Amino acid sequence: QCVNLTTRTQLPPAYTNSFTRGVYYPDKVFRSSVLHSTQDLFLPFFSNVTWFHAIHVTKRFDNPVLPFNDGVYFASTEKSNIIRGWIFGTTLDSKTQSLLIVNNATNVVIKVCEFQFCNDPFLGVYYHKNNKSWMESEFRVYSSANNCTFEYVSQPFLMDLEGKQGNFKNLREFVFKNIDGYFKIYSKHTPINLVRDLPQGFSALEPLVDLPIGINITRFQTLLALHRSYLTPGDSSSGWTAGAAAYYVGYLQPRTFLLKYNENGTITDAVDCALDPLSETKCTLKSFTVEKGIYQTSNFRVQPTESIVRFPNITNLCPFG
Amino acid sequence: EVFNATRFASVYAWNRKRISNCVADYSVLYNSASFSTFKCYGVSPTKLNDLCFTNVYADSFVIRGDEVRQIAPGQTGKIADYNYKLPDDFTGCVIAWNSNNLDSKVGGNYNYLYRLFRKSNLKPFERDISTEIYQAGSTPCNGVEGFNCYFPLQSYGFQPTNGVGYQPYRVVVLSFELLHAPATVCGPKKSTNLVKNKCVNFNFNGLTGTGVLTESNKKFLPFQQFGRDIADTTDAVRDPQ
Amino acid sequence: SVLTQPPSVSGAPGQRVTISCTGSSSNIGAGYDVHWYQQLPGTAPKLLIYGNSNRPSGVPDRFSGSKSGTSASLAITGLQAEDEADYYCQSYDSSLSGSVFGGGTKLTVLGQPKAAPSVTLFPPSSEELQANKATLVCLISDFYPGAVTVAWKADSSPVKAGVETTTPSKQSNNKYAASSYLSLTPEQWKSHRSYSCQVTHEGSTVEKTVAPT
Amino acid sequence: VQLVESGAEVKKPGSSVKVSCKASGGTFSSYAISWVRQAPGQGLEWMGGIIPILGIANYAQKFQGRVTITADKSTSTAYMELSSLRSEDTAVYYCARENGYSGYGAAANFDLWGRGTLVTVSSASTKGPSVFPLAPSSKSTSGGTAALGCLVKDYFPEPVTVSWNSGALTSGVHTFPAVLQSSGLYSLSSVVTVPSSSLGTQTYICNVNHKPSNTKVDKKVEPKSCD
Ligand SMILES: *[C@@H]1O[C@H](CO)[C@@H](O)[C@H](O)[C@H]1NC(C)=O
Ligand SMILES: *[C@@H]1O[C@H](CO)[C@@H](O)[C@H](O)[C@H]1NC(C)=O
Ligand SMILES: *[C@@H]1O[C@H](CO)[C@@H](O)[C@H](O)[C@H]1NC(C)=O
């Protein structure tokens, strides 16, 4: 079960720029000392990406129903493990096979079923007076479930329930794709010390486990968790806190990318083919170093925007009886 | 537990087991050298592992020694028509053996029941647990042990000191179904042995190449299975053993 | 055991409330029919619906049962004043060689407002001291609802022995009443100077202390 | 028809219990009869079902060979015998009836149930009860009302009712439930409100009856003299 909120003020989302983000392994093979390019769903560099805030100091809490496209990029500079999990679905009315991948304090629960998703499912952490530790007690994610067939349990992972207002210390990236009904999850923890304007660093993403659900996903929505301290009366209407968090939502575009493989076998650089003419030349020549000279990348074709089809004077009808 | 258990059920209410999200091998069920009769219609008993079906329905019940020939399509009796009817397109796989050392005891073992009387026939693959007294005439009797109304359920005559045609035989039937759902339970391959430094042929789930297996000095990340090279040739496959 | 059910569900008086239970592929998903029962606290359970296709005599039509694959469903419309019971799902299991019920969920959640409690303290009599025991009683009455926390103290350390709490019952004026005993010995009854009964009800803390001497 | 069962019964931890299931009318010698239990804290279990026509026992694999259920055709009744009781047997049993049918499922349903037999076994067996008087003091009587009653202790087993003047008092009576102690003992109380103008002309007495103990104590209640 869930509860409704009241009308209050919020902050509008801003638009930032990415710097060499959205790179992962496009296959499950080993490559070294080879410059091979493929056609997969990646994120174009220097593109316009959305930015959503989650800090308290006010009362910023936005969780819209964004449409799920072919491949997404969810980067989160997580510090105190505020975001718990993510849900998926089409209409969220207990009619399709919705997804529920949450990361609790005991074990990861990946249950793809037909749960009754409410308008805003959020986790609740209450602060006890006797025990001086943050414990999760308000488990308001779904109402009930009628029938389900798929059920999988992932590996246990520890999480911190204490929320602070300091600077972030870690960075987590999440990539969700859906090809041939299979679900792909790319995640890797990279330590960093920054609040915004992510640097131009490079870090790959390795998959963990493939989920053959065999269904179509068109919408998605992230889940947020709040804390119930002694400063707030304890009601989730106008007094609450969320700590400090910032997540990025990006859409992967079907663009070819040239990857670099060293002797160790990890991804070092990523060169696009439809972003910059310099990178396009490095993409077609299959070399990271280009000398002086003239080359040919592609062609220039002007698509017609109008079509004039008409006749002089002919005018008649036709019977068929 | 379906084969080896402490006790079984009757024929009017038998155990129904479904094999889903699992995998098994029918090679051990053939070389047991402990079954009395083994009939498997619809498919060969030795060529049913390569081809697989969607679901497997297995039922377990007890039967006498003289009624083991009644489990077949194309005859009429007293048990094959009132307890479990066999259709024309019956591709089941029945297995029977003698285990009179567990379901028989001195004094008379009458634990399991059976149905003897019935109004009419029944559709195949249907369970009948109706304990209503079958009426043979046109007047009721309020369910008494008198005239014109007899109880259809009767006891058994199982005894460990009987002969060979009246002993409790553990009979099970393994039926197969071809539905629109993909085949879940099929036949898997096992691990025979490993040989290296010689030109051999292997099939590591993604290719079938002929060559040697030399000991490499590079360790791969624990998320890949294959490996290419500069010339775009798969020459490094991790051994899942 | 093999059948799991949610512990509690919520609903509104006028909306559709749907409850289900999940099992295995050998008891409910094999093909066996399900049976739903109602366990009222104070009477014997009766039959509501069998096979999810027929309607027995004496049961309303608002109950709807269906089987979606390997799980059953129960949907109702309208919450009357007789749904303060538990719902169990029953199906024939082959691995257990018999019938097995579910967990059971509670529909009623809460319908009790607050009020002002009143506690009285009665010391033991003179005839009870010769019985080699001391029963310190603490009666609470005229309060709502019946959810109180009983605590004891001896003016120097709270007591963590011999405490008990009796569930409150409904009075004739829609009120609750309860009592708490304290098993002690007369050897230590006269050594301590006083005894009290500390009770809290929505922040309201009322205190009453007696004196044996 | 209607099936009537026995009331409450308390036994020893390690003895045999003897209950029965009676049937009013007919439709008992033609259908199967099973026994379904229910305990506060967990779900409902199923021991087994017995047929009265053939007299065949059919229990479950979760219950061992410690309970025997018999049937009778002369008076159409059924008995239940269970020895070597434990601390978990504190529950209630029901005498249900089964009516089979035809279909693809063919599951056992319970259309007709019984009344119920409360079988509670614990320590602190039946002994001699003792009631203690209770009188108000000068500090507890500040207005025009008084509070007094009788306290019952070391009584066993349940149930035990309390009457005032052989039922002559109806307004202001309140009976408190029991509670499980550390030694398996129960304790109740009963207080009534009365004006202070009747404490010197009419006395209050408590009449406590006990059916399993065949005792009836009549103690007097008098106000305190020191306060
Ligand atoms: C690459 O480096 C990592 C981290 O040191 C090591 O775990 C891995 O074995 C290396 N892989 C190769 C191919 O050298
Ligand atoms: C028919 O042809 C004449 C001359 O080419 C032109 O002016 C006229 O518009 C035509 N008719 C139509 C309907 O276009
Ligand atoms: C297979 O099992 C062996 C030993 O049980 C283990 O060393 C190996 O890693 C396993 N292979 C897997 C899990 O792919």
Residue numbers in the entry:
A (entry chain B): 14 to 70, 76 to 339
B (entry chain A): 340 to 580
C (entry chain L): 2 to 214
D (entry chain H): 2 to 228
From the paper:
In particular, the HCDR3 epitope is almost completely buried when RBD is ‘down’ (right).
We report that SARS-CoV-2 infection elicits a population immune response that is mediated by a lineage of VH1-69 germline antibodies. By cryo-EM, we show that it targets a semi-cryptic epitope in the spike receptor-binding domain. On the basis of epitope location, neutralization mechanism and analysis of antibody binding to spike variants, we propose that recurrent substitutions at 452 and 490 are associated with immune evasion of the identified population antibody response.
